[model samples]
Target: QTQDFERAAKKLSQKEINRRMALAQAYNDSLNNVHLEDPYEKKRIGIAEYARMLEVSEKIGIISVPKIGQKLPIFAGSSQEVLSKGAGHLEGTSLPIGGNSTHTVITAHSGIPDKELFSNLKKLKKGDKFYIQNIKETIAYQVDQIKVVTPDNFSDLLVVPGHDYATLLTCTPIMVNTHRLLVRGHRIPYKGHL
Candidate 1:
């Protein structure tokens, strides 16, 4: 995975790299400048501002799939945000943002790449790691299993049974946006400067 990540990172254009770095810096600044002394106020302000920061960051870089060396930029936020940004959503899943306890990450095609964002998800096997480095923290997850289900069957996408996990779902077979491919992974410890 490390080798694959390096190769994919090198493939990014200089313009794209700069754009992503700027957005990431902006997100970090936003979080640092936020002022909310009270715990409740702090939580509210953090979520709202972070969501907006994520929106801007999403526009900058391609979401890389280390397994198959695929990279695609995703439009963050709700389903409407995706459509408005001219990107497709994982047909049956929610947004890619992490929740209070568990993180649910989803991605799709923007009709630009021949292969979809999560097309290689189903091929991900147990022990594989998925890493996402945001401004706040570097999150890492270990793949536990891969499951295929109907487009509308979302029961499994909900919170994990008893542990913190990240759920990634997307359409299968590249061009055809019919069935869904789901990948389940749990967060792994990461020690990186935030």
Candidate 2:
């Protein structure tokens, strides 16, 4: 499966690469330095809203952990319904997408009673690395710290000031879920994990 993902990635056309590049520029243009709120309390974005994600997934251009043989689509969309179906880029944070300027934040639902998002996130140890392909070029991140914070502890669940990172968030304590579990990783080279 991992090989297939690598293969799918190798097949990226220049058009796809340009498309990803365009996406980052557009994403930054729309969300840079902005914090949006869902006044209606409904964080659901309907199907057609992000149908492109399905195409991206089939192309196998998403997240993967070669070390653990794990790979899943990066649902670059927002919506509780979409999340239940797959892992996604959490809204309200810098994208795992842009170039150096972004402070990437990713998330998925763990211990979903029936689904698997970041369930094995706890198994990750410092130095463990994973790769993502949300941009034209892929990025790899090495685990640096694992934190457990309450749902309202916004600071703890986000970026680590003065560093490039990819922070993964999921509800902790399983079914109880009273707090957030954050696994933060630092950007690393993709020369095949050392």
Candidate 3:
């Protein structure tokens, strides 16, 4: 919610603002989406443990963009650096991966001429499936909407997901890079292979 407009905003020379805005959104989004574990859980892990946990969750996990024959490690952080390497789970979204009343937004680089990341995202059409995997299970979503809107548009992201869902955001309009391509999907059970 912070500056989604910032990243797709290729016009802004300093990419740091774009990165920071996303990071800020992550911080804000995670408060509602953050998942802590078992009541039986301990008084707990300190900074070192927490950091390691975050690291594993981010760089170690992966997102499967099956529609494009792309599978990349997921970095759960929102900072510019984290996303530079691969897909990122926008900090602070409704969690438990994907479920009723949950909304997860994954951000990445798209629309750059030489870049392949998310470039074909706009090609996704209805019924396409994308998967996000954690250490335990993989959640699936079926594409239902492909929308193009202004970079600042928050109407869709703000709307209550109403069901288990995810939204994929990338830049659009080819080179001008003025708008966003939002591919939305609602969760569905994965049928077969892992």
Candidate 4:
């Protein structure tokens, strides 16, 4: 798997690299100065439109939560179709490519009878670790906080200027899913435990 990832990454064109860099720069700029509203309620873009905006394939990386024995592909958008398969990256936020002031929200569904995606997210606590195998690099983050909030509330998802953060999101209360479970992690030194 690692070998395949390497070759795919090596095949990137210079134009594509520049495009991604521009996207990341714009994302960082938004985080640094803009105040974003609750994206979950603001828009309802389909996976097709969202993927095109990403300017690449939908599957960007792999998210591994060791505590839950979960490793899933990270798709580009958070449409219902995308979430049904694996972790979906919430649009209008930073891409999984990590950097200063970047906060990536990776969300999946809970209580799906056929799939195990985020079914065990509630078990994660502070100090636990998770990882993202991004297209260019791998990032490790340690869980620092957890919150359960209403679906329209997103005050905790903002960037803190200098910090690198990744947040795992899922619907709470299992089959009920009335609230959102936010498991936030801050960037940490890489330690390959898997």
Q: Can you write out model 3's per-residue Cα lDDT over 1-194, one digit (the tens) per residue?
A: 21222223333334553454344345444455334221111132211121123233334245678778777766654445655567766544543255446677776777445757787887788989998764334678899888887665555654264577788776666665677677888889877000
lDDT of 1 by residue, 1-194 (tens): 13333445566667765675566444433332122121111122211233433344344223445786664454443253453332332322323333334435555432326534454566678887776543233466788878766665665666553466665556554556555666777877854000
lDDT of 2: 0.60
The Cα local distance difference test for each model comes to 0.48, 0.60, 0.57, 0.73
In terms of TM-score, which candidate is strongest?
A: 4
TM-scores for all candidates? 0.55, 0.73, 0.67, 0.81
What ranges in model 4 sit over 4 Å off? 1-7, 13-19, 31-45, 48-57, 192-194
Candidate 4, residue 76: CA error in Å?
1.0
Q: Give the Å shift of residue 38 in candidate 4.
A: 7.0
Ranking by lDDT: 4, 2, 3, 1
lDDT of 2 by residue, 84-185 (tens): 665666555666653554566666777667766677777787888888775356888899888887565566434455666787777767766766677778
Supply candidate 2's per-residue lDDT for 186: 81
lDDT: worst 10-residue window of model 3? 38-47
Candidate 4's clash total is: 0
> Against the true structure, whose lDDT is highest?
4
Residue 175 of model 4 has an lDDT of: 85
lDDT of 4 by residue, 1-194 (tens): 23444466557776876676677667656553243333344244344443332333446778899999998887777766767777877765677777888888888888779899899999998999999876556799999989998886776676667989999988878888778889999999887000
Total colliding residue pairs, candidate 3: 3
